[PDB]
Amino acid sequence: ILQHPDGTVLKQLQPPPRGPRELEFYNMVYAADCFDGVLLELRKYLPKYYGIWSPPTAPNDLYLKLEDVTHKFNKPCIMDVKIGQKSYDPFASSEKIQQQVSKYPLMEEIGFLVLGMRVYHVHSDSYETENQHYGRSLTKETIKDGVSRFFHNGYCLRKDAVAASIQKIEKILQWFENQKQLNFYASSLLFVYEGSVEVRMIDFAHVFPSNTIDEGYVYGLKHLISVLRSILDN
């Protein structure tokens, strides 16, 4: 992800087939002549899409031009959470499945994985960053405290941001409970709050047509909501 001053991010397409699939996803959703009520509603929860972009002198180098969801914040606190019970898609080989489950074998049980966070700390005027090994080290015993860490800001637990996060996730869940045409694998929620709320769906390299509820994604959202709810009792 490259941040542009104009309030956008440029995401370089991942190698095939992932990058092309993510392009086609954005193209389908933001199709100008689209009057599909499900897809129109979905736009609210995605970054705004500004189309494919490539450098003037390099047509080979493909990017997506997306809304920077963090742009309107002064000191954004950011957390990326991968959602679902399976991080592999319906066309993965046995080895790919093994690779994906190996990456975090608790995905089925918990239904989400923290990819990382950046937390602004007022007292030090500095950022605490956690990488992918942080979330992958979390178990059922430590997931609540693992998530809570994100909301430690301003000499307190930011229960305001926790409650707001629940409310925004709930709307996304409502969308998922009113559609059976898309299933989402290895996609994320980006959480942002002001450290000095946004919750948006990102990363669509493994979104596929379906004729069923995305039960794994729903499970993930519900468990995430349950964890966040518990944090409100801290």
Ligand SMILES: O=C(Nc1cccc(-c2onc3ccc(-c4nn[nH]n4)cc23)c1)C1CCCC1
């Ligand atoms: O700091 C982080 N992430 C971050 C930082 C700043 C801006 C944005 C971001 O803002 N709008 C976005 C729209 C789409 C995408 C995206 N990424 N992959 N596909 N699409 C990203 C976007 C994200 C990470 C590292 C630790 C905590 C999580």
